[PDB]
Structure formats: structure tokens, C-alpha cells
Amino acid sequence: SQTIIRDCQVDKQTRELVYINKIMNTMLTKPVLMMFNISGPIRSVTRKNNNLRDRIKSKPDEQFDQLERDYSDQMDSIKYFKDEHYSVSCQNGSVLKSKFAKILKSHDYTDKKSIEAYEKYCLPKLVDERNDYYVAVCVLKPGFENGSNQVLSFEYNPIGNKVIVPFAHEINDTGLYEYDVVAYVDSVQFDGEQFEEFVQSLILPSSFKNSEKVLYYNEASKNKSMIYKALEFTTESSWGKSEKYNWKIFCNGFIYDKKSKVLYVKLHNVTSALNKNVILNTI
């Protein structure tokens, strides 16, 4: 149910975004819509083996585990790409905005109410005036969950040396969005400012201990730079000989390897009033 993203430069002009969504692995009863921004037009769409999900996920998870001290368990122009079960179209947001229902019908996404809903709560997040960023429309069809290929791979060419990390949620009534996504983005440049804005708006899960505090970290290390929040608290034995434990869990934010220009993102069960993408520069 978590969303896994891997975006890598595969050569001078091309990048590949691998997107694994929660939906993608459900018994789809009818066509499902997924839309997100991408920094350039797509030229190929493929499905990949499910083993890729854990391979990709382990990377950001591993990086963030290194920050924790979890004493648990202790003993003490529109382009189309189709398949028997999915249908995708790439186009500038303005275009999608200008022909939404037809394009969607094009992918066999009929339900009028649903179309209106997306046009009202989704599209606004995917259409920017300043830059007419591209949008990827994927309609998943029943049967997509049959087999071991519920992983979409988008081959594309970045416009203007930019890379969009698709975090934009659907606009909702409460103004609060719960995130659960991990990401791996290589060949990108650090952006402290927007990383901080994001980290500082996050609300961590609770350990239910009256003594817990949420600390904000923004530290640069030898090779890597980290911006994250963590839940910290102490636990001590009552029997005497107070062997104190300083727990440091629920670390979420951005970790950036300055040497290899790799970005690790983890926003696991955190809430925020921010509903936006992270747009970075390529290297």
C-alpha cells in the first residue's frame, strides 16, 4: 500500500521512472485512473517484475534505518501506450485540461461522476500555468493484477534539465494528506530549501508515550546531507540499575548522497497540509 518510486538517468537524454502504486496490486473491478506529473514527454512504457518493488524500496529504507534506534523486538500532440490491461497517454497539462473527458474516454474510462471528480480535485494539482508540465494518464484495467508484472516503467526525456518527483496528492476537504511513499532519484541536485519546507510541515506518527518529542534535523555529513524529523523518547528500568534507552524512530525526510548525487526519500505515514511535487534540477 506504500508507493515506490525510482527515477534514474539512463543516458544523456533519457530517464526512467518506475512507479509502483498501492492500487496496482488490488482486484480491480473496473478501470482505475492514475495521473501524475513528469518533466518531459514519455517514449516507452513497460511493465516489470514485481521483485523490483522490494529491490527499489530497500534502498531508501536502508538509508533511513541508519538514522534510527528502534529497540523493538528487544529481550529486556498526445502519445499513447497500451496493453491488454493498461492504457497510458502523455501530454502537456494544458492539453489534458482542454480535452479531459475525450482523452479519458480514450482509455475507456467512462464514468461521468468519476471524470468530474478528477477534473475538480485532481487536475488542478497537475496543471501549472508558469510551465505547462507534462502529465501521465494511466488507466488500469481489470486483469492488470494477474501475473507478476504490476510495476510500470516510464522511459522519458527530461525537458529543461528538470526532474519531477510525483508527490502531488488528490485535493481533499480536510486539507490534510497522509503520505506513504519512498523514492530513489539519481543524477539530481540538492535543494535544501524545498526539502526543509516539506520536512517541517510533516506530522509524525505517535509512539503513545507522554514523553515523546519530535526533533527536526538538518545536518550535513561527510558524504551525505540529511533533512528529516524523528520521534525521540527514553525508556528506563524500574527494577533499578536504570539502563536508559534513547529511542529514535519514525525518521522521515530527505537524505542526499553528495558523492553520487542520489536522493533517498521517505515519508512513511506522515501527515501534512502541503500537497505538492518536488521539482529538482538534473546533473
Side-chain angles (χ1 to χ4, degrees), residues 1-21 23-74 77-83 85-97 100-101 103-104 106-107 109-111 114-115 117-128 131-169 171-172 174-221 224-235 239-240 244-258 260-283:
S1 198
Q2 161 166 282
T3 302
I4 295 82
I5 293 174
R6 179 183 72 192
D7 184 299
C8 303
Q9 193 69 40
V10 285
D11 81 351
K12 16 290 174 289
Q13 348 283 310
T14 314
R15 285 192 74 86
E16 174 211 30
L17 160 75
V18 166
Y19 193 88
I20 310 172
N21 208 62
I23 310 178
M24 289 174 68
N25 219 291
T26 297
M27 309 221 103
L28 300 186
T29 301
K30 65 183 178 189
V32 173
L33 220 213
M34 293 190 298
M35 296 168 56
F36 60 74
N37 290 300
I38 193 168
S39 82
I42 295 154
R43 60 188 215 156
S44 209
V45 180
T46 308
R47 301 179 58 162
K48 284 181 166 192
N49 190 278
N50 288 347
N51 58 52
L52 206 70
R53 185 174 186 295
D54 281 23
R55 275 162 38 37
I56 299 157
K57 178 176 156 60
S58 65
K59 265 50 191 158
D61 274 350
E62 275 173 20
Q63 289 303 297
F64 284 88
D65 282 345
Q66 284 182 48
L67 297 172
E68 299 179 354
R69 296 187 232 108
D70 183 314
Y71 305 88
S72 294
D73 320 312
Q74 180 90 182
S77 287
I78 288 169
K79 313 214 285 184
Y80 286 77
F81 306 86
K82 299 166 190 177
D83 176 88
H85 313 101
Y86 74 69
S87 183
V88 172
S89 78
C90 176
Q91 61 277 282
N92 291 97
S94 68
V95 176
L96 172 57
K97 186 181 191 173
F100 206 70
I103 294 178
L104 268 61
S106 178
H107 300 98
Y109 194 74
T110 306
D111 196 273
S114 306
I115 304 175
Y118 284 94
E119 178 150 42
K120 175 180 183 174
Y121 302 132
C122 254
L123 201 46
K125 276 299 175 186
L126 310 167
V127 184
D128 165 358
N131 328 51
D132 194 10
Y133 290 132
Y134 282 90
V135 173
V137 176
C138 329
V139 170
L140 278 34
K141 307 175 194 310
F144 186 85
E145 83 281 11
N146 281 149
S148 286
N149 290 342
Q150 295 77 58
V151 161
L152 287 169
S153 171
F154 304 81
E155 192 189 338
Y156 73 107
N157 298 123
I159 299 305
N161 297 301
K162 291 292 182 179
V163 170
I164 286 160
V165 191
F167 291 159
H169 271 193
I171 300 182
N172 65 53
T174 81
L176 293 163
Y177 313 89
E178 182 173 293
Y179 292 81
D180 191 13
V181 58
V182 283
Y184 179 110
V185 182
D186 74 22
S187 298
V188 277
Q189 175 197 78
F190 190 75
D191 189 315
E193 257 211 320
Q194 74 172 304
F195 288 169
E196 183 174 80
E197 165 179 53
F198 226 111
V199 172
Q200 273 162 330
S201 80
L202 302 174
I203 281 113
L204 271 36
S206 183
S207 79
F208 303 97
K209 288 189 148 291
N210 289 171
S211 80
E212 69 175 24
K213 297 202 288 185
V214 185
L215 279 69
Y216 171 77
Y217 292 88
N218 179 339
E219 58 204 6
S221 199
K224 38 193 76 170
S225 154
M226 301 96 106
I227 297 174
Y228 64 105
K229 278 182 169 188
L231 187 64
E232 294 176 38
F233 60 77
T234 301
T235 54
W239 128 85
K244 283 188 292 183
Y245 294 165
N246 301 115
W247 300 61
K248 196 187 185 184
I249 57 173
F250 303 151
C251 296
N252 289 273
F254 308 74
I255 295 175
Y256 181 67
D257 181 345
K258 297 179 290 193
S260 56
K261 325 293 161 174
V262 171
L263 181 71
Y264 302 90
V265 189
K266 179 169 190 176
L267 306 170
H268 183 46
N269 297 309
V270 285
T271 301
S272 177
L274 266 182
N275 190 335
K276 54 162 288 172
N277 297 324
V278 162
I279 302 188
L280 312 148
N281 296 314
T282 57
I283 293 204

